[PDB]
């Protein structure tokens, strides 16, 4: 597995439901690659951002971003993944509790094997 997610740091927690999500992603890359990493943030449903990283840097690297919150117009009233060349290889889920509180101490990391 050439790229591995080293960690995710939620940077504004807790925050307003209307505030944007500020994340810091740390990843490692063992050797150079030809295609792009695509990072998606998703509210499970609306996509809040899709960041693109290519050429992939070798070694340990970090990036921050600010993704915009979801729209309550689409949400019923009562109610992060990465891919290489379109092949999702890691996915992290969080629980979220208007003040939002992201339960950032219990991430749920799911890894898939792909061909790079």
């Amino acid at each position, epitope marked *: 597995s050439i790229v591995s997610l080293l960690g995710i740091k939620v940077l504004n927690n807790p925050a307003k439901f209307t505030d944007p999500y500020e994340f810091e992603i740390t990843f490692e890359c063992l050797e150079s690659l030809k295609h*792009d990493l695509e990072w998606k943030l998703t509210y499970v449903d609306q996509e809040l951002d899709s960041i*693109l990283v*290519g050429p992939v*840097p070798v070694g340990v690297n*970090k*990036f*921050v*971003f*600010s993704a915009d919150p979801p729209s309550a117009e689409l949400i019923p009233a009562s109610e992060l993944s990465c891919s290489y060349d379109g092949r999702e290889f890691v996915r992290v889920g969080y629980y979220v509790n208007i003040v939002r509180n992201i339960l950032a101490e219990k991430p749920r990391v799911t890894r898939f094997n792909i061909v790079w």
Partner: antibody
Amino acid sequence: VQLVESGGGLVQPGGSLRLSCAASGFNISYSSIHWVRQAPGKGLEWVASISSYYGSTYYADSVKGRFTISADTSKNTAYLQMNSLRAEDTAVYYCARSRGQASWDYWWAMDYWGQGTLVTVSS
Amino acid sequence: DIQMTQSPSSLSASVGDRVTITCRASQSVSSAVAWYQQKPGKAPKLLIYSASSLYSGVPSRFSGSRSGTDFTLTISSLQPEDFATYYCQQSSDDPITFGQGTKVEIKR
């Protein structure tokens, strides 16, 4: 979102000048700030960038040593301190912004620009 | 240092034509490539980001595509407001570099 440059003007070769870019509508801690310049009748040339979250700075070779880019996150403002100026630095200097910050030399597209501020270096 | 060789430097077209502007990168820049429009006395405006994504609020007649180190900006139906400079840009590596520009002038 808005970017407002100020500090342009006229100086002599070897003189100093400091541009400033006041940002509003976004936090500069999660966007990269750029300076792009355009000499009279020429194209755009990248000057410098700052990733204020990581404090990392990058310079075009023609200005390295002479220019210093910096940022104040509490004032949401970036600065381009231009020292040892040369006649070929005469240009309109634009402030620009790209979303996200990387810990390495890599940026997303510049989606907002200032209106530009003229800098003339001459005897 | 990666060079963005833009062509043509100047082209002459009518309203309603299709315009293709190309940019060749001297190395692989993946898709960290953007297209900007500039009119005289005004700041550049972003048109295409990440080589092929159309920026919010840009008329759909603009489009960009990638094929290796060859990047292509296409205007499907030239409008009166569209005559300006277009610059390509790579931001995959230090330094950020621009193409030399394409002035689209009206034919008469």
